[PDB]
Every structure is written in structure tokens, then in C-alpha cells.
DNA sequence: TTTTTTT
């Protein structure tokens, strides 16, 4: 009672479960040792033409006929109802010939790779001969890192956080922070850039800088949905905000930035949400400067320092009088040209899996360093100097009340010019005139029509001198 | 390209194209001043594997409305790849192999300077004019020429006529063979603009503080 | 849904519940594209779908928020 | 082309180089398109294009800018 | 803000 061959071609095709339906609406298949989907391609016919070796050979006849193929197609259409989820394991980096285990280091192949839903891959296969340690490419690019960022006690808090966020790019979680890379001209943190983006191949990705200027909901915006299940999104040339007629990036969208998901649509396509596995790198020479302020905005920042100049002979002389540097060095031609030819793209992916496996093997997460922040430092002081009013502070109210203070309703009364002459004792007030009027009526409460109070108790007026 | 008017920019420019063919392109002005995420950009979706980007016209910036030279527009256009979309497509990387030529009449003035920017520019003078017999005679007494010569009526029709497309071509090959055998490379030329003078002094005559100076 | 054909899906897997004769007929994507045109074909009123607001649905069946049974 | 199916031409002037067997049965449109399919069905993987800056391309050949040699 | 995407 044997029925339709094709039906049987089919089900045993569908059986070595090499094509899988998503919740996305996408079909993946398994061929050539990795997960390929793409919806402009018949990769199912391409799956069926290539396994046709598996069958016996009584079925691999019918294969070489195309309307055939199209027909065990729609079959296997018909019988595809359940969807799967990928991209579940945040430790495994995929290639094109295999994933390798972040966790331990061995290289998994074929059908031990096969469990690992891997949607995406770095584009290139995987050598082991090539990923070692005592190679003459490592000695020449220890010496680029060195120059790029030197180890020293003045440098040694820098570099670290300068390779943990590079090593950060292998996971396949959401990232809390942004990296700003802060330099001046020639400071080398393009050659960064371009090194990083030769490692780690396609996950590596380059977009414009709307996506933190306009608004991602404004219609079509490719840009955030190429974003999409990336593992590093490098943005560069932030515009000077100082010059009248910039545009200053908004805090609302990098908030967004950080949430697991992004709401943006791409052309010929509804669908909306992506899945944020990617951190933002955006590298300048000017600090940036925010529309509003807020407390949340110090949870989400983080900036890397470039201190090192690579100039020709002829402007050896005015690099040494710039105080902005710390070290000159002669520019090298060629390297440019080694980049470009991925001479060392597995001596730093050595690197890189050496610098996770220091860092990020528990869990994943940074400390924020509050005590280098000049442009918010101000913002700072005041909340570390600032105790308000409370219980306590009734019973010695009578000493401070003799001091100006009025108990009112159990309220105290603070005089507007002595807080005005406090503060202007070492702030120049012309200078955050307007910052400060923005505080004080975001923060200003009316005791009545006339009287205005703060609802704080400097501390230099409790404690004695 | 530096010059007044009747200087053999657009000549250049006509020999250049009828030598490298399709390799040539001819762009718009918003690619100097216009946001390249405003939409679709076709005009630098168009740059896709060129070698060779002309621009022409740049416009006097003492007039009204004029927009000036973007510095970080400059510094992003110098770089391997390029972000535009096209129209009815989604990818927005290309890939930069072409060198960008500006023809104007006008020194150009930028929004911000820094040294950056001054990294990034190079340029050519034009010192010849060609005259007609009627008008040769009030060119003798102005600065801005040190020739002049008689206008020649038949050149462009030559120069349509692809005429000198293989001749230029062996002269461009020696040239390249005289010059970009060992490495390539393009190098600044930051003291024909005027406008950074300036900052090229301020340089030299300051020093920082020095431990034997303390 | 507008874009996968779900009425072939339901006519490949109903199929064992048909009787002997008709099982094998459904093996051929061109029988079960007619059978689909007859069906799409033969319905032509509407019904108006979530009418019960104190159900909570699942794949397994349908849990109720009044007594706290579960159906499936 | 991004529009125009140039694997048809190929396949059509490319007729002379097979045995004549082979060689009549590419006059028919249909079996080119039997074949495009195929041919379309086989090619998986993608080369990357344009890696070599000293040369100059032309429409009957490249020439070397190295040596001036010019290859066809 | 009319184009763009939509057809
Ligand atoms: N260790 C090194 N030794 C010598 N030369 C180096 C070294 N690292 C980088 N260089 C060279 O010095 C230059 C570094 O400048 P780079 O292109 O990185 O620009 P940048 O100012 O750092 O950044 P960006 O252009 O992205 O703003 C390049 O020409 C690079 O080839
Ligand atoms: N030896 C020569 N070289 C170049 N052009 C010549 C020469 N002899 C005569 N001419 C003529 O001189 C003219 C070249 O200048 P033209 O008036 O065309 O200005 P242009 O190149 O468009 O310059 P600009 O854009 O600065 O105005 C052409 O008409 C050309 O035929």
C-alpha cells in the first residue's frame, strides 16, 4: 500500500529536521553546516537538490526534475505548523563551518552544531591552525594595542574598561550601557574600528546617526531594522553640538536604546519589534551634550579616552606642545593595507576570547564609574551636598530658627538670597544662569503667594566651624 | 579646483570623462550641504564602486540663505564605506573607491574648523585664461591671470568626439606608473586656504608647560 | 492569517478522519488547492468572533475565570 | 542586471561550445528556462567581487597597470 | 511635508 512517492520523499526530508518555521514567518534551513534564511531565494528547493544523496536510490531520480522539487516543496509547506525559537544561547559565537563554545573553547561541526538555533554567523570559515597562540601575527599586533592604549598605573583603569567593552561584543544579550570613544585626530581608534569589524565579520554592523537624531517611529527606518540580531553597531562623526544650528542628541532615544527590544519597521514589511543583541560604539572628538538631564541618563553612559598620537616627521614638532596627548609616535603606511587583508583577523579573536574569559564568564554587567563626569559633575556635587529637612532636625530647628528660619506649620522658611549667596560664593551664577533657573522651577514650591522656601538644610549651617 | 572663469576646469573635466568612460560620475551639490538621511539619497547611492566623483558650481556663500560647508559631512565622505539608501531598495552601505573633485571660482568657507578637517584638504590653482581677440586686451592688467592665450572654436567638438580618449589614457597610465607604483596615498595641502592661516599659526607661536619650565 | 494558506494545513491534517477512500486523495497539493477553492467557495455568512470577556485563552484549551476549571 | 534574467543570454550563446547533442536542445525557450532553474538551484554560496585596486577594466578585456600588460 | 511606500 505504498501512496504518493513525493508525499514520502517529503516526509522523509521533513524527519532530519533541516527546515524549521519561525515566529517571525521566516523558513530556515540547514545547509552547508549552517542555518541560512532569506526570503527572496527558493533555499527550500535548494535544501531538496542537496540532500538528494541521503535518499535511496529509487527517490533521487525524481529529484533533478524542478516541477518535482517545487511540488515535495509545497508539501513540505503544508506540513510545516508549529514555530521554533533561535537565538536562545548567549555564549556561542557562530561561523560559517561551526560554532564555537565561548564557555570552554572547543569547536562543535555539523550535526554537534546543529542544536544551537545560530540564525546568524560571521561570515567566513573557521581555522584551528590559525587560533593560536605563538604566532608572528601576535607579536605585531600586541605591539598596535600597546600603542593604541598603553598599560601603565596612569592607564591601568582605562585599558580595562576599554578591552571589556571590545571582549562584550561576543555575547548575544542586551547591553545597559553605550561606548563613546572620545580622541582627537590620528589617535588610532578607527583602526580599532576596522579591526574589530575584520574579527567578528557581519555581526559587526555600520549605521547612520538618525538613530539618535529623529524619531524611530517616523515612518520606514531600515537603519534600526538592520540593527536587528547584531552583536556591535559602530556610529561615527558626531556632529559638533557647540556651533548654533546643531541638533543635540535627545535622552528619550537613548533610554530606548537600551531596552531588550526597538520598535521600527523596514520597507515591504510590518513587522516591528527586533531583538536588541547589540552594543552601540559611536567614536568622537567632541563630549556630547544632552537636551535634558535626568538621573536616569548617569545608568547608561560609559566613555573610553584616546591619548595617543601616530604623526609624520613634519608635524612631529606641534604634536609634542599639544597638551591633549601624552605620547607621539611615527604613523605607520602599510598598516592600512594589512587591515584591509585580514591579516590579523584570528590573532585578536584570540584576544578577544582571552578578554572574556577574564571579564564576563559569571555574569554580565558594569560598574559606572561616577567620578570622572565634568559635564554632569556639578549636577553631582549638589546631591552629595544637600541633606534635607526631617524628624530629627525638629528638636534642633530652634537653634537654626534664631538663624532666619521662621517655623511656620511646622515648614521651614528659607530666605531666597541666602541660598542665592551660598551658591554664588563659588559658582559664577552668570555662567549656569539659565541651569539654574531650570532647577529651581522644575524644584521651586509656593508656601504662598509671597514666601518661597527650599526644602533643605545645608549642613555647614547645623555643624559647627 | 581653484580658478576664475575660462580656465580649462570644464576641459579637464570633458578629457577625464572621455578617458575612464563609465568609471566617471557626475553628483549633485546636496552631497556638500544637504543631511544625507533626509530619505532616500540617490545622488550618493549613485557613488556605488565609481572612481572617480566630479562636483561642479559651488554657489557664493555672501548670498542670503546659503549653506556652508558641513565639517563632519567632509570627514564621513572620506570614509571605506558610505551610508545611503536608495530609492525602492533597503541596503544602505556603498562602497568609496572614487576621488571627489570640486570645481568652483570661490574659496570655500567652513561652518567649524579643527584640525580634523584640515587633514582632508588639497588644493589646485588655474592661472591660464583663453580669450576671445575682441575682449584679450583687458586681461593683460589683471592679477588673477599670468597668460593669456586666443580661444580655440573647434576643441570641444574634438573633445566630444572622443578624439583624445586613448592619448590621455597612456599619459594618465605613465603618470600613475611615475607616481602610485609603491604605496598610494593623497596628501594634504592645509596653507592655500585661507581661512585656516590662522589656526596654523596658533600652533607655533604657544607652548605647553614643560617639568624643566615649571 | 494573510500570508501562509492555514486551509491547506487543516486539509493535510484532517485527513485521517475522512474515510478510506478519500485519505489518499489528499497527498496531491493540486486536489487540496480545489478543495480549498470549493470551501472558500461555500462559506458566505460572518460570525463575530470573542464574545466571552472572562475567558483567558491558551493552546491547550480555554481556563475560566468565574469557577477556575480549566477546559480543553 | 537587477531586473533582466541575463543566464537565458549565457545559456544561449554559450550553445556552441557543447556537443551537438546538446547543442539543439537550448533553441527552445522552455528548456532554457528548465535549465536557468537548475542552474540557479545548484549555485549556493556568494564571492565577493571588485578586490583587486590596480587593475582597469574594460568592455573586451583588463589591463594591468603593473606592467602595462593587457589580458583578454 | 511632499514625497516615499503604497500599488
Ligand atoms: N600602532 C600604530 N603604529 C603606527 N601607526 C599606526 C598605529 N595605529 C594606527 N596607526 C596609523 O595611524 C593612523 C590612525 O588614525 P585613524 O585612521 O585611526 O584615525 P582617528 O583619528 O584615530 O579616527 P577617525 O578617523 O575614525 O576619527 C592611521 O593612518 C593608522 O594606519
Ligand atoms: N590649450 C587650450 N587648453 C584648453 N582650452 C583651450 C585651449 N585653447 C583653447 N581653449 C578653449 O578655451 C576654453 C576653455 O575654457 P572655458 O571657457 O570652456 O571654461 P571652463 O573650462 O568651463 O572653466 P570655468 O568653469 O572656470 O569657467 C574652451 O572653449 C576651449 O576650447
Not at 302 to 318: D, K, N
Request: aromatic content about 10%; proline content about 5%.
Amino acid at each position: 500500500l505504498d501512496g504518493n512517492k513525493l508525499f514520502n520523499i517529503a516526509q522523509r526530508i521533513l524527519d532530519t529536521n533541516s527546515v524549521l518555521l519561525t515566529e517571525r514567518g521566516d523558513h530556515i534551513v540547514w545547509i552547508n553546516n549552517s542555518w541560512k534564511f532569506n526570503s527572496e531565494e527558493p533555499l527550500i528547493t535548494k535544501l531538496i537538490l542537496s540532500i538528494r544523496h541521503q535518499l535511496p536510490k529509487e527517490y533521487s531520480s525524481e529529484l533533478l526534475c524542478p516541477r518535482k522539487r517545487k511540488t515535495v516543496e509545497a508539501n513540505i509547506r503544508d506540513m510545516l505548523v508549529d514555530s521554533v525559537e533561535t537565538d536562545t544561547y548567549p555564549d556561542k559565537l557562530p561561523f560559517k563551518n561551526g560554532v564555537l563554545d565561548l564557555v570552554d573553547g572547543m569547536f562543535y561541526s555539523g550535526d554537534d552544531a546543529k542544536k544551537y538555533t545560530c540564525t546568524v554567523s560571521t561570515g567566513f570559515k573557521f581555522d584551528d591552525t590559525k587560533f593560536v597562540e605563538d604566532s608572528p601575527e601576535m607579536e605585531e599586533l600586541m605591539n598596535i594595542i600597546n600603542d593604541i592604549q598603553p598599560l601603565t598605573d596612569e592607564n591601568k583603569k582605562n585599558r580595562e574598561l576599554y578591552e571589556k567593552t571590545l571582549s562584550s561584543c561576543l555575547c548575544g544579550a542586551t547591553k545597559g550601557c553605550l561606548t563613546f570613544f572620545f580622541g582627537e585626530t590620528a589617535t588610532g581608534k578607527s583602526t580599532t574600528k576596522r579591526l574589530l569589524k575584520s574579527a567578528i565579520g557581519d555581526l559587526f554592523v555600520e549605521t547612520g546617526q538618525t538613530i539618535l537624531t529623529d524619531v524611530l517611529d517616523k515612518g520606514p527606518n531600515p537603519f534600526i531594522a538592520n540593527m536587528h540580531l547584531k552583536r556591535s553597531v559602530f556610529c561615527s562623526e558626531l556632529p559638533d553640538f557647540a556651533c548654533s544650528g546643531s541638533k543635540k542628541i535627545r535622552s528619550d532615544n537613548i533610554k530606548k536604546l537600551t531596552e531588550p527590544c526597538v520598535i521600527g519597521r523596514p520597507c515591504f514589511s510590518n513587522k516591528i519589534n527586533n531583538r536588541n543583541h547589540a552594543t552601540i560604539i559611536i567614536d568622537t572628538n567632541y563630549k556630547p551634550v544632552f537636551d535634558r538631564i535626568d538621573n536616569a541618563l548617569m545608568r547608561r553612559i560609559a566613555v573610553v579616552r584616546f591619548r595617543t598620537h601616530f604623526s609624520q616627521p613634519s608635524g612631529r614638532e606641534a604634536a609634542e606642545n599639544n597638551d591633549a596627548y601624552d605620547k607621539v609616535k611615527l604613523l605607520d603606511e602599510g598598516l592600512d593595507g594589512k587591515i584591509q587583508n585580514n591579516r590579523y583577523r584570528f590573532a585578536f579573536l584570540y584576544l578577544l576570547v582571552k578578554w572574556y574569559k577574564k571579564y564576563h564568564i559569571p555574569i554580565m554587567k558594569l560598574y559606572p564609574t561616577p567620578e570622572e563626569i565634568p559635564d554632569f559633575a556639578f549636577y553631582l556635587k549638589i546631591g552629595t551636598l544637600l541633606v534635607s529637612s526631617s524628624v530629627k532636625h525638629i528638636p534642633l530647628m530652634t537653634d537654626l530658627s534664631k538663624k532666619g528660619y521662621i517655623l511656620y506649620d511646622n515648614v521651614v522658611t528659607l530666605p531666597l538670597t541666602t541660598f542665592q549667596q551660598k551658591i554664588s560664593k563659588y559658582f559664577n551664577s552668570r555662567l549656569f544662569g539659565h541651569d539654574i533657573e531650570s532647577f529651581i522651577n522644575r524644584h521651586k514650591k509656593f508656601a504662598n503667594v509671597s514666601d518661597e522656601y527650599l526644602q533643605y538644610i545645608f549642613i555647614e549651617d547645623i555643624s559647627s566651624p
